[model samples]
Target: GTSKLKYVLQDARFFLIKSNNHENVSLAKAKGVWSTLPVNEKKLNLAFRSARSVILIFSVRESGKFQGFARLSSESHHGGSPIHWVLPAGMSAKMLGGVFKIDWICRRELPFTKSAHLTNPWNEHKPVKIGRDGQEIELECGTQLCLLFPPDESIDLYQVIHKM
Candidate 1:
């Protein structure tokens, strides 16, 4: 199914969130919400992670081309608060059937392409990064590896966005 919206994503309501748990997946239906960014509470409802925020990366297509990025979070959430993302559409002021890969940043900073591939069932919605932004990520470890080592280059969207 296809879930459409207004003003923002142009009816692109179906969110293909990379699961943090082994018991969930990307399935769109009714209201269009999913994935909560937490491994423990991964069984919330149809969709939407418990995570407060996430960094979503966009691309041109299956072949791969940097598109854009957006950091989004839930709304007022008075219960069932869907992620209100503002997608800057490229054509006709609409995102159309776009593809994206979300980084479960914050909390622990995890990626969605761990066990994913180009030909997998979720091929059309696989994760992809433009450049140095998501190249090197600092793992969230305790004492020994936390303060001693300087973290590697994290997300630098500025350089990746328009660099040649």
Candidate 2:
């Protein structure tokens, strides 16, 4: 495997909507706005917080290959993990669902560090279609289901751009 990992949770939901302005916000902000709503803040926080390091364990009801992803913040000590496979369309991503052991030890020494463990339900027979532009993901129902690792207390004061 290449030593570099692609950024997995840059701004996934931005693609779900039709407006370019809406697609401009990062995943973290999207979750934050939604969190203040009548929902669980913890879950929303983790979803946005863990968007960078949490490995993609499963994919369901999807389409088009997962052409690589970007990290939430470009200022991390190192780059983020990337999705290698361009998942086929019309089939559910059942293969992505399963128990994932977090690489907890590795995160301790890194920035934007976080481990993950997820299991998804894929639909092989009917795959969903992903958009080429930032107008295909559905954040309303929560498109990017993510898992984050521990936060870096040392640099918690750091700040990244809210969104483009």
Q: Could you say which candidate leads in TM-score?
A: 1
> Which ten-residue region of model 1 has the weakest summed lDDT?
1-10
| CA lDDT scores, all candidates in order | 0.26, 0.25
Candidate 1 local lDDT, 1-164, one digit each (tens): 11111112221122223322222222211222332323312222212243322333322224233222233333212233333432334423122222222322112222324212222122233222222212211112111111222222443433322311
Which segments of model 2 are wrong by more than 4 Å?
6-23, 26-41, 47-52, 55-164
Q: Give RMSD to native, each candidate.
A: 16.7, 16.5
TM-scores, each model vs. reference: 0.22, 0.21
Local accuracy of candidate 2 as per-residue lDDT tens digits, 49-79: 6444322211122322221222222211212
TM-score of 1: 0.22
Residue 48, candidate 1: alpha-carbon lDDT: 27
What is the alpha-carbon lDDT of model 2 when measured against the actual structure?
0.25
